[PDB]
Paper text:
Carbonic anhydrase IV (Car4) is a newly identified receptor that allows adeno-associated virus (AAV) 9P31 to cross the blood-brain barrier and achieve efficient infection in the central nervous system (CNS) in mouse models. Among the generated AAV9 variants with higher efficiency for infecting the CNS, the variant AAV9P31, which includes an additional sequence (WPTSYDA) inserted between Q588 and A589 of the wt AAV9 VP3 VR-VIII, exhibited efficient CNS tropism with 385-fold higher EGFP expression in the mouse CNS and 1000-fold higher EGFP expression in the mouse spinal cord compared to wt AAV9. Car4 is localized on the luminal surface of brain endothelial cells throughout the cortex and cerebellum, and its sequence and structure are conserved in Mus musculus and Homo sapiens. Here we report the cryo-EM structures of AAV9P31 and its complex with Mus musculus Car4 at atomic resolution by utilizing the block-based reconstruction (BBR) method.
Numbering used by the authors:
A (entry chain A): 587 to 588, 588A, 588B, 588C, 588D, 588E, 588F, 588G, ...
B (entry chain A): 219 to 588, 588A, 588B, 588C, 588D, 588E, 588F, 588G, ...
C (entry chain A): 429 to 481
D (entry chain A): 482 to 588, 588A, 588B, 588C, 588D, 588E, 588F, 588G, ...
E (entry chain A): 219 to 271
F (entry chain A): 219 to 428
G (entry chain A): 632 to 684
The structure:
Amino acid sequence: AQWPTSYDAAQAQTGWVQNQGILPGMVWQDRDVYLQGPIWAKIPHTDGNFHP
Amino acid sequence: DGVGSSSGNWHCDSQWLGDRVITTSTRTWALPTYNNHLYKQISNSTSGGSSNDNAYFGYSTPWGYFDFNRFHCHFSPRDWQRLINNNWGFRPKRLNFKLFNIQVKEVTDNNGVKTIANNLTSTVQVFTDSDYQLPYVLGSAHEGCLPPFPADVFMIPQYGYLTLNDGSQAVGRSSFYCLEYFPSQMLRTGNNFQFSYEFENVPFHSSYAHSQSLDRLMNPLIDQYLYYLSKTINGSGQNQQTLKFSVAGPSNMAVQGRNYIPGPSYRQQRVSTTVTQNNNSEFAWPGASSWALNGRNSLMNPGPAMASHKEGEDRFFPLSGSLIFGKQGTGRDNVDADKVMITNEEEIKTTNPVATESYGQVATNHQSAQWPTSYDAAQAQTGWVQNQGILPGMVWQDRDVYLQGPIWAKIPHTDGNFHPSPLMGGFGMKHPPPQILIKNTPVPADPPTAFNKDKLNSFITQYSTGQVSVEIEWELQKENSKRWNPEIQYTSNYYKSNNVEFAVNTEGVYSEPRPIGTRYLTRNL
Amino acid sequence: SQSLDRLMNPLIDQYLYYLSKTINGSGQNQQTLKFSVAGPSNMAVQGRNYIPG
Amino acid sequence: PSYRQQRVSTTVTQNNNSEFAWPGASSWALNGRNSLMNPGPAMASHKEGEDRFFPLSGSLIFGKQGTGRDNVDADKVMITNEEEIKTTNPVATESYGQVATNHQSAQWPTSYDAAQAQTGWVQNQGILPGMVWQDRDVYLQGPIWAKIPHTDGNFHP
Amino acid sequence: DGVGSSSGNWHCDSQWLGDRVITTSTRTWALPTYNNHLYKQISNSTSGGSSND
Amino acid sequence: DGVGSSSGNWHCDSQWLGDRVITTSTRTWALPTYNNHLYKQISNSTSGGSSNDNAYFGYSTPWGYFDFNRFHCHFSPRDWQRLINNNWGFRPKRLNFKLFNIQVKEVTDNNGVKTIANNLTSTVQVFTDSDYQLPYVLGSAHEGCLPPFPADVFMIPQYGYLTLNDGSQAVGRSSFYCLEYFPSQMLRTGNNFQFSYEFENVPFHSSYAH
Amino acid sequence: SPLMGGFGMKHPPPQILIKNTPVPADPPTAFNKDKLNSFITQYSTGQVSVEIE
């Protein structure tokens, strides 16, 4: 709000989130498979992965 | 049945054992006739022309349901104090549910005077959705729970559900459920109903606060064997670039290397309880920080567990990042701040980011010196991180539970989820306690003496009452801390007052004066 | 057959409050704090346990 | 995942002629206190073909034998580099990628409404499904173990 | 008979098996007094003069 | 339950043995609805401005209690004469309590005329504070005991208790008790209640003069 | 020994509490979260027997 001096005061501002990573409490569905689509894939042999 | 015999007993107490506590609650309920025994399609168009964000399509059913998904339904205030002052964690194990002492009454309203009489031959239908084949509405923090005070008589809420909508219209994928399509038994006089359920394995709720912060886990006496960049120029300037490194360092704890980082964040607008400090503009929706789904904006209600405010300022709260309860007798439309109770998660500030602050800063360019040409050279620039997703090495605490807060929620049946702890607090399960549906069996009035194929729409006015008992066994996690100084404990204030806290007033109205958390004891890390 | 933002009971209010007004309107020094119950008519601001992926 | 770090060159003449160790540090805050994002998420130290660049605080820096403790030169310290994990982890001093920030549209009724496609830089990216990464390497002079903080939740501790 | 006891249950569902399906339906009925407990002879003449058909 | 069957009997007499006497008393009681099923905070301020000596703070409950803590509740005047004219001392040993023949009535008061009818499906809740977890008010010489004459019908008194007070105000140490926080069972039609108790060892009362 | 006369005990005969179970009147057909304050006017009567040796 105002408080000592004037220029310091500023209204609430928001920004757009174009990319969002995983957060706790998130839920989602994986991509659908198709009759012409692939069946399986090999998970790369790495130290870590998420939802492979 | 009969004057000299009952169909059920008292059963209202709490038993404390070594590592277990068993709570039993008994209440008296009243069940009216809902929707005149009809299923009705409902939508936002039936309540005027609203915005796209509030459009819905669903059905209202003549059934009622039992709700005890709140902690005060099972713990007395003193029992809650015993739980939170002596245990590091707790979790439900199994529950027992009983329905008994059914009484069905019929009402006649002729020429003004109203008469109520017993209807001994009427029935009440009860079933449990143990296969989770119906929409689950117990995880939306709705009213109609068992009253916290055992002496109160409560009304059973009406069951309704929503499905897919396009504005106020439906689509072919929308589902219609008839609750009479579930097994129906024939009952005699004096019957009772009961069933048991076992809670699936859930983690203990963290009913403690951390005595250490994530950025202060090092030894304050010993240096690290790691170096950090401390100087880039000698100072003065023309061509003074250099690279100097230093050891950190109890005197430079900020730049020390660390193994773990604070959990995820999602920026919320900051609101002050001192109204003169807020901006002189209407910002509740404009600065709400919401999320969108299929073109519909939904408020980011509490959301990720984040610290409510920085240290030394409890007058600030996130716009929609905290649970807000209403005081006893508080209205429902545009009430003042003194009529509501705003919770704060200040305990988790040791591991979770502040809800009204940026997660941190990140580099947004490549600093470069002169090199061929001049305009190409640019100083280092950073940008604010307003939302940060999960990163490896992240740690966080979940939202606290409250005496007036919800207990459990149903995890949506989807392909994937991450850390399915309910955002309003509690235990998230794939198979939560099943919904218990109840309804009065319709009793038609006198039909005409000539056959008519239309369904009957003239019934005897009836309602039912009875007693309901729910018993839940909880597992306890004891504390074995080596802390020397005394801990912080929840306690009542000795100072005199007109009324006793968590009691009834002169008019006989029970009230809960403040919200009670669970994080009073402390532990390291 | 259900959306993540429409999992609540459309007939029963929540026991949680949300900030609904910050000024009385007109202006010079009109800051205030008003809270409300949501609310089948205000499903957007209801508290929820899970969020989209 | 990634978390942008400032890029510093071992060739001092290539760096900006200004004092930036704290100002461009890329830190995180807790209870009003700023703490350096010391090494942090495991990310590739530099792009291929340039080992003269290192992240500001994204690498373990050991001291040589007999090295002092206050304001020592670069030749007195040993800067590690995680160049091996560049096959799966993002470069520490680069953006994770680009994302769309608007709706491209053609003409349609009126003119000013029309807008070309625009993209923005992603400086920090959290965990997403289908992500894979390698953890930070261990060293002969490095630590062996650590205690996971006793909290309600953590990810990949 | 009695408030605490019923004489019948829900029994309304359908069970699907390999080569069999079992359907169960339960409804509530109302039965009035018909014809004032009398048997009555009826004919087309009692409803006017109709055709031979 | 039923016309042809009762749930309890006469049981009103006194048996004299060698060194023991057994007294049995049966009375008919009436229990109204107290406090409109509410718990109410009470204090001296609610009854005007009294002196500091009479200040109090407590609660009134919708419960009633049974009182037989008077000698005429068990001894007839002739039985009392037999006791005091022939014995140097006496003391209680054990007691048996029974509640039976419960009848719940509902009252309708429309346009003046009052009608009373049976409510066969209603229940009455009874419990004993065998752990002494509630304030004890039977040792204050209060009214509401069983009438000395067996033929009299009496009203069950309302239960209330007091706690710590500072004038008409309360303090943090004050306790609030809810009687519904005790075990509650589901009852059918025609039930009865009974329990036994053994008196702890007490000295004989000196029923003599020196 | 009680000053008004009699036998003083640490564990005297326990208090026996009794109450009529409330029976609410007809509730409204629309849900309301407030506790019910409309009950059927009732009272109870019976017999009590106490035997002391």
